[PDB]
RNA sequence: GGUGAAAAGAACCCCGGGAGGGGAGUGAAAUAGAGCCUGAAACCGUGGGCUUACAAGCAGUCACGGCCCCGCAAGGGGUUGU
RNA sequence: UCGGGGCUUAAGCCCAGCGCCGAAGCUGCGGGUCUGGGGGAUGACCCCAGGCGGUAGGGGAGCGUUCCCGAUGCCGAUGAAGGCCGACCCGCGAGGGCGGCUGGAGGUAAGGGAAGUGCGAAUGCCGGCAUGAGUAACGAUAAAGAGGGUGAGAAUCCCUCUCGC
RNA sequence: ACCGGAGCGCUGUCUCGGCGAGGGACCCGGUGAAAUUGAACUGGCCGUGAAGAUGCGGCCUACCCGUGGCAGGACGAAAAGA
RNA sequence: AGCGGCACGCGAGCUGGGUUCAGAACGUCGUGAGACAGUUCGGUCUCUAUCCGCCACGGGCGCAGGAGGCUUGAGGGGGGCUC
């Protein structure tokens, strides 16, 4: 509600495209050695672990 | 009845001179050939008009002072981008253009008018890629 | 067979959850499980839970064995819209909408013979 | 006497909508945009009918000319002969004998330049 | 009309820099509950029709039924003591089927007591023997007196 | 404003904090499931048929080509390269 | 930049002959329509001639809707009214029949009649859903950091330590 | 705390701007409006046109869609022109 | 120490000093309220760019085997002074 105001409606397809380069994005996982599950890369899993795996006190 | 529709016709290559011919008079013909308009089986919407390879363009002739006179313009979107080269220098550097040009504006323009220009392959020479038929003409 | 579990009458606007769904659309239970564990949109919680309940039907009802379970159709169709008012000055009470959606995961089985 | 319209209008609009159903843009689901577009479409249909006439007249005459030169010479002459012969038809439509069965044609060519060539 | 609304008479908007429309009361027709235009009102349709003309109506109409041969002047209906079944048996006997209505022109109320209930017998009486009912019905089952009514009615 | 003829208005197991759902079960019907009869359009979804990454537009018209689905034929509908 | 192109005994200018193109104009074939005439008592129906761009606007006809006479009747649970689908039929049309799907109890022919009747628009009235835009903003620049705890779920709640206004 | 003229000192007012600041802007997640909106499939030149065009002729540049950024134009939005 | 065009270029880019708002006065005309190409002092340029266009930057596809690495110059832009 000031100077710049859309002059004529935006067509559905346009909305679509603006959101074409949008859209959701995949995750990516890595195998946990000395364990058996998935973790983010170089991270630690409270179910798996790093070297030695500090914590891992899941009930 | 219902007027006839050529099926997938084979593309007949040709070959024309260059040297000695008048620049414009040439295309006039050449053009027609690029389309099916010589063919007794022409059709607007298909482009089956003869692949015209051309030899020794560099020796195209033309009338009057057009050698010097005639100006080949080119304008980038940049303000002041108008560059006008003369027929003269246009012979000297990449002369093949001059034909291809005189030509390219004797076709129509819808997406196939340019498909047709691809159906044309001049050289300044003779020489060409002897691919096949290309029966000389006149 | 197949396994139906809809998420009717649920908070959050479509676009967001519509985005959440299409990422996992048509995949394994194990797979999508691990995906949901590591995706960053509250949809993650919602879709994951409703997907798990979609698997829950296929356990004690229709039964197609959990091993074979693959995901079909997950659509997320908009519901109504919550209508509230916005503190915009100069005398105008704007209108604001907290939308609601319909996540619908249907996970069938592996083979068909 | 509740002269309540009813649904009448919705039905009529359904008609014209179905008439336009297919076009690109909301004009395929807008029962007013559909109307305007439709208007254009119909007037177009009429014009394109008379235009269809001279269109195909032309195309015929095109292959006729090119093939005429292929055998002997120009279309103008060809026809002029056919006329100053007695061939009170040839049927520009079916002048396209050149298309299928060039023998017929070339014979009529002989008859053409014979007429008054 | 639009005038009778328990509503305002004061313009809701300015009349210029509103940005909106340009109106006033919510009793105008173009709004929601706002009144209608020239329509729903208490209007009697009745009019005047010349004597003799419409008189002839009866005449003509009644006379037309005499071309249609369905009428008679029973001096007395044997359905004495207004019971349905009496005049019913009398109907069967006098040639009254069960599928032709009775503008039953006649005058004794006891007779029409039975006819006051028959469902293919409107029971028409004489003091208001009318053309419309003559057309929708079937039986000039007149007593002599009803015909005296139809007689004195004309007089020309 | 309106479930249904009638509350017979959903026990029980299932996942889930619930929310809500999946059978069970209710009735002729639960696509009558609780502001629920009947569910137009705008309206945003989802699957599939056609088409689109040299391409100039009041967006369709007309014809030619091809792709899919129809049809016993001949014919058709849908689509759009030109 | 003559529209362009390209043309220099011309594809320019002038002048002569013939040809062809090319308009919805005109010829033909077919159906409608209107005026006159004729056959037909013949209404119907056919032959013939001539008109049929068109805003305001004048004349003629018709489709449809809401209710009444028609209705103590006619239609209908084997299924009314809408609703959805359509490449069939009839009418120039507006519509009507048909059929498939839906739905659940009203509907009304032929003939007449009574009218709040036919929407695309009035920065028109109400209601609904979008557009921008997953963008601007999410309220003071005094400011937050960690430990444990509750819990299905802790930046956002609570106990402690630390910082700052 | 009213309008000029002058002079000193002083100073990023200027020559002429360069870094630095934190906070907004930009990327992650939670929430998420507005005016305007005939429909759009929206480059340019040169003419035209009711006289100032992506839509018309002639004739134009450039694959398809986006992010940040500027503001000439859409006779830009808000004012049924004071 | 050129002249001129482009809405006598440019306020969705700035300024608002000049301008033709309401105050007041000044010279001034009018019996007068008020008015005067006559003057004077003050006085609110509206954060969010939808499409085009421009400048930088990417994602997809492309190039009729699949990957790296090094190139070629179509066309276009800049640079051209001067004591």
The set of strand I positions with any atom below 7 Å of a protein CB reads 12-13, 46-51, 53-54, 58-59, 75-78
Among B4, B38, B44, whose Cβ lies nearest the Cβ of D99? B4
Write down the domain spans for chain C.
2-110
Asked if A38 lies within 8 A of C39 by C-beta distance, the reply is: no
The set of strand H positions with any atom below 7 Å of a protein CB reads 28-42, 44, 59-61, 65-67, 74-82
Contacts of residues D70-78 at CB distance under 8 Å and 24 or more positions apart, as own/partner, are: D70/B38, D70/B40, D70/D98, D71/D102, D71/D105, D71/D106, D71/D109, D72/D109, D72/D112, D72/D113, D73/D113, D77/D112, D77/D113, D77/D117, D78/D109, D78/D112
Gap from A27 CA to G45 C1', in Å?
85
Among D56, D66, D70, whose Cβ lies nearest the Cβ of B3? D56
Asked if D63 lies within 8 A of B44 by C-beta distance, the reply is: no
Q: Which two tokens stand for residue D104?
A: 């017929």
Among B1, B39, B44, whose Cβ lies nearest the Cβ of D66? B39
Whether the CB-CB separation of E75 and E145 falls below 8 Å is answered with no
Asked if A29 lies within 8 A of C20 by C-beta distance, the reply is: no
- E102: exposed, middle or buried (C-beta count within 10 Å: 0-12, 13-18, 19+)? buried
* Experimental resolution (Å): 3.5
Tell me, yes or no, whether chains D and B touch by having 3 or more C-beta pairs under 8 A. yes
- Beta strands B52-54 and B120-122 are parallel
Taking CA–CA distances from D96, the nearest residue in chain B reads B3
Q: Which residues pair with D9 in a beta bridge?
A: none
Sorted by sequence, the CB contacts under 8 Å of residue C86 that are 6+ apart come out as C93, C94, C95, C96
Give the method used: X-ray
Residue whose tokens read 């004061």: E10
Find the nucleotide nearest A8 (Cα to C1′).
H37
Query: Is A26 near strand H, with its CB below 7 A from some atom of it?
Result: no
Query: Which CATH number does C2-110 carry?
Result: 3.90.470.10
Query: Is A14 near strand H, with its CB below 7 A from some atom of it?
Result: yes
- B49: exposed, middle or buried (C-beta count within 10 Å: 0-12, 13-18, 19+)? buried
Prior bond to C86 cis, omega within 30?
no
In chain B, residues 4-23 whose CB comes closer than 8 Å to chain D: 4
Measuring CA to CA, which residue among C103, C112, C109 is closest to residue C24? C103
Q: In the complex, which subunits touch C with 3 or more CB pairs below 8 angstroms?
A: A
Gap from D87 CA to I83 C1', in Å?
92
Q: Which two tokens stand for residue E52?
A: 């003799």
Q: In the complex, which subunits touch D with 3 or more CB pairs below 8 angstroms?
A: B
Q: Which residues in D lie closer than 8 A to residue B3 (C-beta atoms)?
A: 56, 59-60, 93, 96, 99
- E37: exposed, middle or buried (C-beta count within 10 Å: 0-12, 13-18, 19+)? exposed
Helix (H) or strand (E) holding D5: none
Residue of A15, A27, A41 to mutate for C, most C C-beta atoms under 10 A: A27
Q: Which positions 27-66 on chain D have a beta carbon less than 7 angstroms from any atom of strand H?
A: 27, 30, 33, 36
Residue B72 contacts D, CB cutoff 8 Å: no
User: What is the CB neighbour count within 10 angstroms for residue C35?
Assistant: 21
Measuring CA to CA, which residue among C112, C106, C113, C111 is closest to residue C29? C106
Q: Which residues in B lie closer than 8 A to residue D98 (C-beta atoms)?
A: 40
N-to-C CA span, chain A: 55
Give the torsion sign (CA, E75, E78, E82, E85).
negative
Asked if B1 lies within 8 A of D93 by C-beta distance, the reply is: yes
How many angstroms separate the CA atoms of B79 and B20, rounded?
40
User: What is the CB neighbour count within 10 angstroms for residue D45?
Assistant: 10
How many angstroms separate the CA atoms of D77 and E8, rounded?
88
User: What is the CB neighbour count within 10 angstroms for residue D66?
Assistant: 19
Cα→Cα distances E57→C68, C98, E52, E66, Å: 92, 76, 8, 14
How many angstroms separate the CA atoms of C18 and C74, rounded?
9
């Amino acid at each position: 509600a000031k100077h710049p105001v859309p002059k004529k409606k935006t067509s559905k397809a346009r909305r679509d495209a603006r959101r074409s380069h949008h859209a959701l994005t995949p995750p990516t996982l890595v195998p946990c050695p000395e364990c058996k599950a998935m973790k983010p890369p170089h991270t630690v899993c409270p179910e798996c672990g790093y070297y030695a795996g500090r914590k891992v006190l899941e009930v | 009845m219902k007027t006839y529709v050529p099926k997938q016709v084979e593309p007949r290559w040709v070959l024309i001179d260059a040297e000695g011919k008048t620049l414009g008079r040439l295309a006039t013909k050449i053009a027609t050939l690029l389309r099916g308009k010589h063919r007794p089986d022409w059709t607007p919407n298909v482009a089956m008009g003869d692949f015209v390879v051309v030899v020794n363009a560099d020796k195209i002739r033309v009338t009057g002072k057009k050698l010097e006179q005639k100006i080949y313009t080119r304008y980038s979107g940049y303000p002041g981008g108008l560059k006008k080269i003369p027929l003269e220098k246009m012979l000297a550097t990449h002369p093949e253009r001059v034909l291809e040009h005189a030509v390219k504006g004797m076709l129509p323009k819808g997406p196939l008018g340019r498909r047709l220009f691809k159906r044309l392959k001049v050289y300044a020479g003779p020489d060409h890629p002897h691919q096949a038929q290309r029966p000389e003409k006149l | 067979m197949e396994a139906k579990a809809i998420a009717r009458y649920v908070r959050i606007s479509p676009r967001k959850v519509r985005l959440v769904v299409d990422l996992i659309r048509g995949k394994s239970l194990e797979e999508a499980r691990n995906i949901l564990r590591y995706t960053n949109k509250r949809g993650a919680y919602f879709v994951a839970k409703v997907l798990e309940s979609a698997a829950a039907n296929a356990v004690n009802n229709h039964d197609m064995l959990e091993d074979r379970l693959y995901v079909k159709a997950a659509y997320v169709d908009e519901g109504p819209a919550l209508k509230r008012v916005l503190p915009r000055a100069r005398g105008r009470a704007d209108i604001i909408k907290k939308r609601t959606s319909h996540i619908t995961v249907i996970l069938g089985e592996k083979h068909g013979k | 006497p509740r002269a309540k319209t009813g649904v009448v209008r919705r039905r009529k609009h359904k008609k014209i909508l179905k008439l336009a159903k297919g076009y690109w843009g909301l004009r395929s689901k807008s029962f007013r945009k559909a109307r305007e577009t439709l208007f254009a479409a119909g007037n177009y249909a009429y014009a394109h009918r008379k235009r269809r006439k001279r269109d195909f007249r032309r195309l015929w005459i095109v292959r006729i000319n090119a093939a005429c030169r292929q055998h002997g010479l120009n279309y103008s002459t060809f026809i002029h002969g056919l006329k100053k012969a007695g061939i009170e038809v040839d049927r520009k439509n079916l002048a396209d004998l050149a298309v299928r069965e060039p023998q017929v044609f070339a014979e009529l060519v002989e008859r053409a330049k014979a007429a008054q060539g | 009309t639009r005038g009778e609304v328990a509503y305002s008479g004061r313009k809701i908007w300015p009349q210029k820099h509103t940005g909106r429309a340009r109106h006033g009361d919510i009793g105008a027709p173009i709004f929601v509950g706002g009144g209608v235009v020239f329509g729903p009102k208490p209007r009697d349709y009745s009019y005047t029709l010349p004597k003799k003309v419409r008189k002839k109506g009866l005449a003509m109409a009644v006379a037309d039924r005499a071309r249609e041969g369905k009428l008679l002047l029973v001096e007395a209906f044997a359905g004495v003591n207004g019971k349905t079944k009496e005049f019913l048996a009398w109907a069967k006997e006098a040639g009254l089927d069960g599928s032709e209505s009775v503008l039953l022109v006649t005058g004794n109320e006891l007779v029409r007591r039975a006819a006051r209930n028959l469902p293919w017998v409107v029971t028409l009486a004489p003091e208001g023997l009318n053309v419309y009912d003559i057309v929708r019905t079937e039986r000039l089952v007149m007593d002599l007196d009803a015909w005296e009514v139809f007689q004195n009615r004309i007089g020309g």
